Every structure is written in C-alpha cells, then in structure tokens.
Amino acid sequence: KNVLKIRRRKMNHHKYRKLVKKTRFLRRKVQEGRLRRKQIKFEKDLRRIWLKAGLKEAPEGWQTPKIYLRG
Amino acid sequence: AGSRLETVGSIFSRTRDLVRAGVLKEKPLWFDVYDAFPPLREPVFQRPRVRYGKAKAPIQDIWYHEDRIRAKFYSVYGSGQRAFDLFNPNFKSTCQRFVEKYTELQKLGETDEEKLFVETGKALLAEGVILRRVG
Amino acid sequence: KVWYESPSLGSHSTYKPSKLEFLMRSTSKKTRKEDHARLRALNGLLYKALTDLLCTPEVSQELYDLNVELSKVSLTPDFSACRAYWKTTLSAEQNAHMEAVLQRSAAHMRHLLMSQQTLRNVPPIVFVQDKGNAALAELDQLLAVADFGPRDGRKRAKPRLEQDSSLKSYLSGEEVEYECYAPD
Amino acid sequence: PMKGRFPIRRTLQYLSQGNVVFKDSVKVMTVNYNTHGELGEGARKFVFFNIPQIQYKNPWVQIMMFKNMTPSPFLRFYLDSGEQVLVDVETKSNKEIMEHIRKILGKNEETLREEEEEKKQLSHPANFGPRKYCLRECICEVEGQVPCPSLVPLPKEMRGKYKAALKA
Amino acid sequence: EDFDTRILEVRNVFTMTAKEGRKKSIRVLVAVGNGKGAAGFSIGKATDRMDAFRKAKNRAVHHLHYIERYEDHTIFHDISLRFKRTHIKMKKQPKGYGLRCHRAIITICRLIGIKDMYAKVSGSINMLSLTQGLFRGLSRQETHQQLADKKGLHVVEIREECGPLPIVVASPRGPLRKDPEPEDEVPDVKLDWEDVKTAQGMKRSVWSNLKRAAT
Amino acid sequence: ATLNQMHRLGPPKRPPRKLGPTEGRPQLKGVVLCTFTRKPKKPNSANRKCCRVRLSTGREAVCFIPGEGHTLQEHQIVLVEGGRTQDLPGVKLTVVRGKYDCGHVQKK
RNA sequence: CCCCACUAUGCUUAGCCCUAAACCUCAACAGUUAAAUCAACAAAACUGCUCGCCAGAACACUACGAGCCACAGCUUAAAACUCAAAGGACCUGGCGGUGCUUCAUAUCCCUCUAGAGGAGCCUGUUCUGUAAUCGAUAAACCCCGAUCAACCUCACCACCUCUUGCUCAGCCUAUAUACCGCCAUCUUCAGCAAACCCUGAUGAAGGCUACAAAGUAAGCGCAAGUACCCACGUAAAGACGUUAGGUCAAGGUGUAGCCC
Numbered sequence A: 001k002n003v004l005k006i007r008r009r010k011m012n013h014h015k016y017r018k019l020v021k022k023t024r025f026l027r028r029k030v031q032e033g034r035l036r037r038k039q040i041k042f043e044k045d046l047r048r049i050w051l052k053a054g055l056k057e058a059p060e061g062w063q064t065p066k067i068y069l070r071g
Numbered sequence B: 001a002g003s004r005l006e007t008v009g010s011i012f013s014r015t016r017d018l019v020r021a022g023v024l025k026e027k028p029l030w031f032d033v034y035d036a037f038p039p040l041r042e043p044v045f046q047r048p049r050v051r052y053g054k055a056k057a058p059i060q061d062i063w064y065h066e067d068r069i070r071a072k073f074y075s076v077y078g079s080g081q082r083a084f085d086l087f088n089p090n091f092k093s094t095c096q097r098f099v100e101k102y103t104e105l106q107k108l109g110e111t112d113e114e115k116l117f118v119e120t121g122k123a124l125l126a127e128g129v130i131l132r133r134v135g
Numbered sequence C: 001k002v003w004y005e006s007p008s009l010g011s012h013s014t015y016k017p018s019k020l021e022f023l024m025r026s027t028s029k030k031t032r033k034e035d036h037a038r039l040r041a042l043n044g045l046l047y048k049a050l051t052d053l054l055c056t057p058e059v060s061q062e063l064y065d066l067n068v069e070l071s072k073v074s075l076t077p078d079f080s081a082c083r084a085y086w087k088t089t090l091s092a093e094q095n096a097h098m099e100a101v102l103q104r105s106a107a108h109m110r111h112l113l114m115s116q117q118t119l120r121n122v123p124p125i126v127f128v129q130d131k132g133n134a135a136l137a138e139l140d141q142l143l144a145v146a147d148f149g150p151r152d153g154r155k156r157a158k159p160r161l162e163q164d165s166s167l168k169s170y171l172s173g174e175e176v177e178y179e180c181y182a183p184d
Numbered sequence D: 001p002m003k004g005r006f007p008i009r010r011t012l013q014y015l016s017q018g019n020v021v022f023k024d025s026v027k028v029m030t031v032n033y034n035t036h037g038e039l040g041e042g043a044r045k046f047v048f049f050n051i052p053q054i055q056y057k058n059p060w061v062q063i064m065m066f067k068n069m070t071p072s073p074f075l076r077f078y079l080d081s082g083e084q085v086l087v088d089v090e091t092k093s094n095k096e097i098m099e100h101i102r103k104i105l106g107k108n109e110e111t112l113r114e115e116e117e118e119k120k121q122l123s124h125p126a127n128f129g130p131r132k133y134c135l136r137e138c139i140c141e142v143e144g145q146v147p148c149p150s151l152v153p154l155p156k157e158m159r160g161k162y163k164a165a166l167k168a
Numbered sequence E: 001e002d003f004d005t006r007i008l009e010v011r012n013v014f015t016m017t018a019k020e021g022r023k024k025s026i027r028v029l030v031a032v033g034n035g036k037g038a039a040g041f042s043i044g045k046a047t048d049r050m051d052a053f054r055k056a057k058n059r060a061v062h063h064l065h066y067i068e069r070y071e072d073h074t075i076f077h078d079i080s081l082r083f084k085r086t087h088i089k090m091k092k093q094p095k096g097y098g099l100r101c102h103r104a105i106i107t108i109c110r111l112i113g114i115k116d117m118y119a120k121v122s123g124s125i126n127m128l129s130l131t132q133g134l135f136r137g138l139s140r141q142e143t144h145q146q147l148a149d150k151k152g153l154h155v156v157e158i159r160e161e162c163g164p165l166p167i168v169v170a171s172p173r174g175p176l177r178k179d180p181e182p183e184d185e186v187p188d189v190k191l192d193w194e195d196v197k198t199a200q201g202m203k204r205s206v207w208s209n210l211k212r213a214a215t
Numbered sequence F: 001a002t003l004n005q006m007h008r009l010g011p012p013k014r015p016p017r018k019l020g021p022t023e024g025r026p027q028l029k030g031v032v033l034c035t036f037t038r039k040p041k042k043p044n045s046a047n048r049k050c051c052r053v054r055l056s057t058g059r060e061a062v063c064f065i066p067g068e069g070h071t072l073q074e075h076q077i078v079l080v081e082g083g084r085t086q087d088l089p090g091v092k093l094t095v096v097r098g099k100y101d102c103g104h105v106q107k108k
Numbered sequence G: 001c002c003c004c005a006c007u008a009u010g011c012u013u014a015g016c017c018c019u020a021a022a023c024c025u026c027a028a029c030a031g032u033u034a035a036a037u038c039a040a041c042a043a044a045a046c047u048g049c050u051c052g053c054c055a056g057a058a059c060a061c062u063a064c065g066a067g068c069c070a071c072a073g074c075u076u077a078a079a080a081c082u083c084a085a086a087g088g089a090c091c092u093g094g095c096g097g098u099g100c101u102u103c104a105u106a107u108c109c110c111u112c113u114a115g116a117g118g119a120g121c122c123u124g125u126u127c128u129g130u131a132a133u134c135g136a137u138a139a140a141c142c143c144c145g146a147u148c149a150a151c152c153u154c155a156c157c158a159c160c161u162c163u164u165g166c167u168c169a170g171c172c173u174a175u176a177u178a179c180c181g182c183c184a185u186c187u188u189c190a191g192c193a194a195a196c197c198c199u200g201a202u203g204a205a206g207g208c209u210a211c212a213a214a215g216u217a218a219g220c221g222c223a224a225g226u227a228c229c230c231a232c233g234u235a236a237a238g239a240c241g242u243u244a245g246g247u248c249a250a251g252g253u254g255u256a257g258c259c260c
C-alpha cells in the first residue's frame, strides 16, 4: 500500500517536535506554574477533609508533602 | 429459445423444464431415450474441491495375505532371473510358485513362519527350481 | 508457489526445445514471461553439464590439464547452436592452444551429452573466446608486426457527468404491389 | 444473523412458551448441574433451554446455578413456609424435568384460567375513556347517539351561540 | 414473441486507449422472460447504445433459467442468500401481497411471473450482483414435491383461512416412511434479527409499510 | 461483538446533535454591521454580496444576501435563516428577503 | 549524497526510560473440509466460544486532565472551525535520470561520397521600419498558397465618388475550435473491423500455443494487379486512428455580424 497516511502523520510529528523545540523555555515556565497550582489544589482537597470533619487544624503532626516536585 | 447454462442443473433438467414452459416447441431426439434409460448419476456440474485438515480420500490400498510372502521371497531370493510375461493371463512366476507351495504347507497344519519358509525352498529345489539366495 | 509465479495452466505440457519445433512454431505467438524461464533454466543445465565434463580427467586428458573455465553458456533460442563462452587467458599463445583443443573436443562432447539422455537433443556446441583478453590478442599480434617508422482556467466538466438526451429523444417519440403492362 | 447457538431462545415467542408457573410458595430455585457426564445431559439442556422460560414466567423467583459442586445434578426449591423440595434430575431429560416440577410446584391450568378471567373484569366494555384503557372514548361513537360536533355540526337550536341570541 | 425484455442498467464505460485517449462505450444489462417461469439476463457491450440493446436481449434468451413458482404466483420458501457483497432476503407471501421488493427485483419478478413476494436487499446494491444473485437463489429453490421425495413424507399445508383443515400439497412418489420425523424440542436454525425485531414490534421504521402504487 | 460485550456496553449512544449557526432555531434577528462581497472558492467566479451582522444571541456572523441587488446598510435590521452558501466557505446564514429592512428583489 | 579525522554512542557494571513497519500487517482456544470456493489482493473457505477494539475525513502519535525515577518524555485522549468526500483493492492509459533482448541499411553511431555552416549574390522568413494586406510558421513553415506582385493581379494605405448597387444584391467580415472540398503527418507503418462465439461467478477486462490449449470472421488497408523499359526498380497506392494539424483568402457553406 501507499504511505500517504504515514506521511501526514510524519509531518505532523516533525512540526510538533520542532514547535516544542522552539518554545521549550516557555513551556517549562508554564509547566512549573501548573505544578504549583496542582500542589495548591491538592492541599485544598486535604484541608477540606479535616475542616468538614469538625477539626479546626490539621491532625497533630501532619504536614502535607510536596508530591509533584521533581525531588 | 433455450439455455446454455451448463452449470445450472443438467441437460435433462434444463430441457425438461423449458419443454414444460413452452420455450422449446419440440423435444430433442435424445430426450425420450434419456428418460427411459437414464444414467446412474444425473450429469450436474460440480466444482472439485481440495481436501483440508482431517479429510482424506476413501480409496484403500489393495493388499493380499500372500503379499507378505512375496515381500520376503523378493528380499531373500530377489527377483527371478526368469522374465515376467504379463501378456499370458495364466503366467506363474517363481515367486508365485513359491507362494502356492507356501500356502499348501500352511494348510497341512504348519503354523511357524520361519520354519514354513525354509521347508518351501527345499520342496522347490527337489522339483528342480533354481533358488539363488541374494546374500 | 513463490513470489515468482509458477501456476502455469499448461504446466504439464512437455517442454520440447528442438530445431524442428521452431520451424513449426507460430512466430505470431508471443512468448510468455515463464517461457523465458524454461529457456533460462535449460541454459543453466547446459552450463553445469559442460562445466562438469570439463573438470573430469577421463573424458579427455588434454581437456583436464587445460583447466578451462567457462564464462557463460547461452543456447540460441533458434536451437541451431549451443554458445559456450570460455574465459580467455592472458597468455596470448595459450589462448590459441586452448581454443584448438576445444574445437577438436567439441565434436566428441556432443556425443557425450547424449549419454545424459535428458540433455540428449543438444545442438552443435560452439565455443567463443572472451574478447576481453582475446580482442587485445589480435591487436598486439599486429602491433608488433606493424611498422611505426624511424622512431625519434476553463472549466473542464467530468466526462461521467456529461448530459445526454438519447433517452429523452427515445421516450419523447416513437421514431417515425401489382405490376402490369401499359397501365392507365 | 442472530449471535449464538439456538438464537430461538432469545425471542419473546420462545420465552412465553414456558408452561411452569410456580405457586406463590416458591421463592428460590437452585440448580446444581455438571458440565460433563452423560447422565447429567438433561440437566445441562434444562439450564440451557428452560431456565430462561422459567425465569420469564416467574420474574420474582430467584434462580441460582451451581456447576460441578456435587457428583449428580439436582434441583432444590425453597418455599416461603421454610420447606425445601429436592428434585433429583440425574438420567432425566430436560422435558421430563420441566414436566416434573410443573406437577409438584406449578399452577394447574384451571388456576391460571381463573386469573385470566379476573383480569378481564378490569377492562369493562361499557366504560368510556382513552383508547389505552377503554374501547370507546365518548358516547358520540355509538350509532344512534348525537354525533360529535367535530364531525357533524349541531342544529342551531342545540348550540349556545344561538340560544342566547334568541333569549337576548 | 412470448418473451418481454426489460432494461436493468445502462452504463457509460470509458476506456483509456494507447493512441485515441478516453473512448466511450456502453455496457447494458437486460433481463428477458415470458411470465411463465422462463427468464434470463445478459450483459451487452457496444459503442452504440442500441447495438448493446440488441446483443443483450438476443443473448439473454439463450441463457434462460426456469424458476419454480408456488401456485404460479410466489416462491416455494423463504430464500436468504449472499452473492459477493449483495445480500438478498426473500419471503414467501400469500396472494394479494404484491411485489414489495427492490425496483429491479420487481421488474425481474414480472418477467418470471411472480406476483407476491417480499425482498430486502442489503450490502452492496450492485445491479449485476443483484440480478445474478437473484437468479441463483430463485433457481435453487426446493419445491414441495422435491421435499416430499427427499424425506418420503407428506407435505401438509396449514392455512389459517381454512382453519385446521390439513391440505396435502405434495406426496412422495416412492414408498412412504413409517417413522415420524424427529421432533427436535428446539431447532438450531439461524434467525434474522430483522425478522425477530419485527415479530416483537421492536422494529420501528418510518419508511417501512408505506403506501405505494400497485406493483 | 459478543453478547456479553453488547450487554456490558449497552445500547449505542448517539452523539449529541450539533447545533448550527442559528443554534437550533429557524431564524434569528440581526443588526447589519458592514456590507461587502466575497469571492467564491474555485472553480466558481463571482462577487457574492454578503454582510456581517450581530445576531440577537450576541455573536457576529457573515450572512449571504440572496437575489440581484440589495439596499442593506449599517445599523439596519434583518432576519437571517440557516442554509449554507455552497461556494462561500464559512457562510452558513442567509438574509430573508422581504423581512424588516431587507426588501424583496426589485423585478427585472 | 562522495573522501578523511574524531566525539557522544554501540561494550561492561548498577540504575532508569518503556518506544518500533514491537508486523505472519493472521487475537486466544476448539472444530470442519461439506456446503456458496470466493467483492479484490494478501494467506484456500468457514463454524463455535471468549476477551480486546472500531463506527466519514481532517483537526490528532494534538489540546486539557490524570498517572509515571519519565521534566524538549511516555501512556490515556477530545472539542471548536472546515470539507463531500477521505479510503481499500484492482484495471487501463500516460510516464519513468525504467530492466532485458533484438533491431534500424542511406540508417541511430562509426565507416563511404558530395554538400550546408565562413565569402558575395539570389530568394523566403523574422525583426525593425512604413499611412499601407492576409495565410503558412517544431518535426509536418521558411523559392510555402505563388507552374510567380512595375499598372493590373490586390484582398492593403490615403484621398474622392456611388447607394436596389455585374446578380430576385453584395461582404477576401469573425469563427478551419461548426464544416464540405483538397491535404500534411506517423506511413521509410500493417493494421482497422461490423456481425457472432467463449473465458473471468455474466466485475472493469480477456480470447495464443501447429505433436496447437477458444476463437470464427464479411469488409477496408497491405498484398495482388496495373503505369513506366521486365517478373527488377521507380511511380502510383497506403486503411482506421494521431496532431480540435493546414486552408472560411480556391470555391461552397453552418452560426454570428455589416447594409450610406
């Protein structure tokens, strides 16, 4: 068979890889911001739990970890 | 008006039907003979198909009890230097003469195979037959 | 079969390559793609048959000592002769001796090919020296003899959509004796 | 074509051909059958062919199946009283199994005929209403009665538009 | 003179040629029949459309099929077959049902002499596949006499208009079996979901059972 | 699919039908913003009279004005209906001739 | 792309990353070879049963979300705007910086003889010029329509004149891409082909083997015959089709246009 469908996919992937290459510094700043909001959204979900259960502060000795950082 | 659809039924069925429908005004000369004396199988086109998997032809190999005696005789004594004459319908080869004596001695009550084969060779030598062992 | 097709309908037909068949063959007939394959395969057998005869000592002690090597073997499709190219040695005089021995042997070789009855109907075998070294042999023979002297956008409608009124003309309208002398 | 072997089983006509309508006592029917063995063949065909018909006629009876739990196949029925009915089905055909449980725990044809008659009392022919519940919607559909004004206009004397006009 | 000819397809075929480029030829499909069971079809090819008409119709009468008809008005049994990618499902129908079939099947049925039949064509609606698929299915229908001879039993027709009266339609010419045909409690026959969906009333289509001219 | 798979997946779910430029409505009222002509996509050649209108829904859209000759002007009221102009890419609305400020085409 | 040098890398060890045209492009298991063998090609056609998956193209191996030792990543994976197609297989044609094979007999190359290409002149065309025709115009135009222009010819230009006009008018006005007529061209070819028949499942298509296997073929061309000095040679002949090839300005003529 012909490879015309593969050729369409080939160009789409080449242009995408090149686009990501050109903007990899902007995309890295955007990704960093999303992970911060993701962490904040996670901390809120846990705070909602103890607050809806009648507690006024987090359980004694509980520190919400950073589960989205590269470290 | 007629039909050349040779793969649709048979010449008889196609002819009989078109005669009923009035398409053929007169019956062909052969129709009445076919009707009175039809073939064993109605000649209907069929496409020969190839066998696959566990399907095997029903034809069986033709063997006889004496074939065991013939195989041993050819192994021990080889084919006779006498030439087969397949034109004579009553031709008897040295192997056939051996087989007939072998059968006669078996009917006399002997049942051993190795013993029934050695006594047969002696009988023929007494009758003047040449039996040169191959080895 | 293989990607190379071998479903020939007349597969069982007996291949008969003889000089007589060519004269009764129809030149109007156009050779099949696989008709060449039968010729190509026969040529391979003729190569193997001659090549094997060449290396056996007994057939001709003169032939074996020469250690002749055949470059190619292509039978004529006419069937007149079996071309048998033999690689030419660099030694100029040895190309004549090898050639002379081959010509004498060739006559006996044809009978020896009848010993292998499958190849029995073999045409007269012809040996050809490879000109790569042989052509130069002729020149150098003359070269030494030679005297060199004292040295010093209109819309195109689809043909399938083209409108026709043949039916409209059909449906519109169904298309539209005694002889005597001295008649008065 | 319809998927599976014996697609007839997945038709409303087939499912309505069951003749086993359990008495109200029957609450649970367990089927213990074996996947292999010549003596359990009827029980396998019973599960294959008839369990769907039994369930269709008895939607509120729990039917639970159990494979290869015991050496022989059997049916066990649990009744509301607390009684249990063990039916050995080894060596019996699927048709005999259906006929057996019909005899011991199925409603007879008389009891079913009565129920069908009591249902006919619910749709009284003399009642008028929507076609869903009644044969006729209005008395105007009865021949001899004053037809509907939608089909035949009424005399001016029988219409309020003109009764008031004369009176006023 | 007893045969009528009907056109089923007229196509303009375009052949690319080595020296003359795209040339226009005509491929015609016509069916012939006498209305009494004898019918056939043939393809015609020519540069002119009227020469193709002559070839197909004249050729068709030399390749006639005979089609068996139940009571000279319908088929003997339901026929469901596929020819290549064209599926044809035909149903035996009573008198007065008419020809509720693909228009080409209607045309072919009038040439054969079938008056009452339902047919549904699914898959590829290729006129040629439909024509030869239809003739293949109509030529392989077993009559009641053939069924009686094959099974050595009576063929008994039960009609609801005649109540419980048993009407023997065919009896075996040879000896009559004494052993009843085995009564399989449940037949292992393959069913059409369209037929079952209809019988149950779950088949709702705005295009089915529409009022049409007499055919 | 198998019967078990057909059971587990259930009856097919139709895609929710896509509302067109009228948002599933027969006509919309619009205010003309500007008038202009559009070139049809090849092989067609013409200057098709179109306009941009603000629809009552708030969204602005290009609408084809059918007929020979119109007098539409900015700030005028028109009624627009569905129907794509086949040779004008992106033009999916049509002005109704004879409603509000858009009058009927003047004969010949 | 070709040549040289050298690095990451290909290796080991320990961790990652988790992709492939990861493809027999054939899901696992069981069964069948009788039915219809079968859209096509691939790889003979199917049945039972189960899981996975698919529902026009493109957007899209993308966006967002989530997960992940991944941080220019992987997995899962949409929508809006847009279109009437996209796509699969096969056939034919065209084309190939496409293979092989055998060829051209004044013939493609070399070989043979005399030329053209340089000079002057003659003549045609182009271009320029002029108030001042037209047509031909790669092979297949260019001493061509012309076996022929000082006037005439003549159809061109300028000026003047006539208006039922040499004609029961006239027009060399447009259209040879409406045509007849007469031709160029391959042709320094041998094929075209009605009417039938058969194969491919009655698909587009195809139809030859001489120890022959589905073709038969009227007619046309070639051939034969005739002309010239033979039976040789040279003429003549040369179909269908190719180039919407040439010619409306040989004449005629369709359509359109002019009529002080």
Ligand code: FES
Residues within 6 Å of the ligand: D137, D138, D139, D140, D141, D147, D148, D149, D150
């Ligand atoms: S419905 Fe009965 S009066 Fe109208």
Ligand SMILES: [K+]
Residues within 6 Å of the ligand: G023
């Ligand atoms: K592969």
Ligand SMILES: [K+]
Residues within 6 Å of the ligand: none
């Ligand atoms: K090609």
Ligand SMILES: [K+]
Residues within 6 Å of the ligand: G116, G117
């Ligand atoms: K010169």
Ligand SMILES: [K+]
Residues within 6 Å of the ligand: none
């Ligand atoms: K012409």
Ligand SMILES: [K+]
Residues within 6 Å of the ligand: G248
């Ligand atoms: K002219």
Ligand SMILES: [K+]
Residues within 6 Å of the ligand: G248
């Ligand atoms: K003219």
Ligand SMILES: [Mg+2]
Residues within 6 Å of the ligand: A008, A011, A012
């Ligand atoms: Mg793209």
Ligand SMILES: [Mg+2]
Residues within 6 Å of the ligand: F083, F084
């Ligand atoms: Mg419209």
Ligand SMILES: [Mg+2]
Residues within 6 Å of the ligand: none
């Ligand atoms: Mg290194």
Ligand SMILES: [Mg+2]
Residues within 6 Å of the ligand: G011
């Ligand atoms: Mg190593």
Ligand SMILES: [Mg+2]
Residues within 6 Å of the ligand: G022
């Ligand atoms: Mg691999």
Ligand SMILES: [Mg+2]
Residues within 6 Å of the ligand: G027, G028, G051
């Ligand atoms: Mg699996």
Ligand SMILES: [Mg+2]
Residues within 6 Å of the ligand: none
């Ligand atoms: Mg899609």
Ligand SMILES: [Mg+2]
Residues within 6 Å of the ligand: G061
């Ligand atoms: Mg990828």
Ligand SMILES: [Mg+2]
Residues within 6 Å of the ligand: none
């Ligand atoms: Mg991605």
